[PDB]
Amino acid sequence: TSDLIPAPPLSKVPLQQNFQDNQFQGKWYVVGLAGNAILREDKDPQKMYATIYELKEDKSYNVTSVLFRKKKCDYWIRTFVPGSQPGEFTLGNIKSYPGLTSYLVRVVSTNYNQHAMVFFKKVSQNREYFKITLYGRTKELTSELKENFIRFSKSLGLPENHIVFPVPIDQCID
Ligand SMILES: NC(=O)Nc1ccccc1
Ligand SMILES: NC(=O)Nc1ccccc1
Ligand SMILES: [Cl-]
Numbered sequence: 237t238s239d240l241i242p243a244p245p246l247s248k249v250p251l252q253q254n255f256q257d258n259q260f261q262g263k264w265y266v267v268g269l270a271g272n273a274i275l276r277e278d279k280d281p282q283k284m285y286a287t288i289y290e291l292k293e294d295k296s297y298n299v300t301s302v303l304f305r306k307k308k309c310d311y312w313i314r315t316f317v318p319g320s321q322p323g324e325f326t327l328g329n330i331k332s333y334p335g336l337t338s339y340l341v342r343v344v345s346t347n348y349n350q351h352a353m354v355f356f357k358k359v360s361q362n363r364e365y366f367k368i369t370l371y372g373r374t375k376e377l378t379s380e381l382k383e384n385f386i387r388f389s390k391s392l393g394l395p396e397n398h399i400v401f402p403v404p405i406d407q408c409i410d
Contacts (some may be wrong), residue, residue, distance in 0.1 A: 241272040243366045246391040249355045251345045255297060255323030263288050265409065267377050268370030270389040270399040271356075274289050284375060284402040288407040289316075297327060302408045305335045309408040316341055329359075344375040344388070349373060355389065368392070375404040 264287050285303035292298055297316040302309055315328030319340070328341035338359035346352035352371040357364070370377070370385040382401065389399050 238363060240363065241393050241398070243272070243357050243364045246342070248392065249342055250344050251321065252323045252345050255343055256348065257297075257318075257322070258291055260343070260346065260352070261289050261291055262373075264373060265352030265375050265404075266369055266370035266384060266402055267351075267372040267375070268385045268399070268401055269367065270354040270370075270385070270394050271365065272394070272398065273365050274367060274398050274400060276397045276400050282400050282402045284404050284409060287369075287371070297325070304405055304409070335363070338352070344368070346371075351377060352406060353385060366392070368394075 263286055266284055281373045283304055285301060287299060290298045290300075299314045299316050301312050304310075316325035317328045319325050322344040325334070325341040327336070327341075330336060330339065334345065336358065338357075340357045344353040344355050346354075350373050352369075354369045354371065355366070355378045357366045357371070359365075368385070368389055368407060370381070372381075386396070386399060390396075
């Protein structure tokens with residue numbers, strides 16, 4: 237058994253106008269994180285991790301994340317394939333992920349060189365998850381960007397305790 241805040245309908249999730257795929261490349265730090273399966277846990281606060289986007293020849297992205305867990309660096313790789321409009325993607329090689337029947341990415345807003353907000357929705361074991369990531373090119377962002385992110389997450393039905401600001405670290409992500 238499992239209870240989840242429902243995914244918003246896509247009409248409520250804006251799309252970055254005139255998305256520039258090659259400017260979105262490079263390292264982004266995960267400055268904010270929110271979702272129906274994200275919980276604020278004060279006993280054990282989430283550590284910052286990073287995500288690198290690289291354009292392949294075919295204009296899919298190789299997307300690599302690194303996190304510091306159990307005293308080591310863990311890498312995971314995914315392929316984002318361009319969707320129906322610029323700034324939208326689906327997950328490549330979906331059959332290689334057991335349980336996963338759907339996966340969508342939509343870039344909500346970015347200025348490419350400081351901040352981005354990205355929306356993810358997926359269906360895993362027939363359950364529907366969503367998250368919003370607040371990316372920064374650096375590890376800190378203005379109170380304004382963070383409050384903007386809180387507001388947007390709440391507009392999608394997420395209460396405060398489903399919204400976390402991972403703690404900046406030095407291991408693995410520099
Ligand atoms: N900063 C930056 O790269 N901006 C940009 C580039 C091309 C088109 C639209 C916006
Ligand atoms: N917790 C969590 O990771 N949720 C999630 C992940 C990927 C896509 C959509 C939602
Ligand atoms: Cl990410």
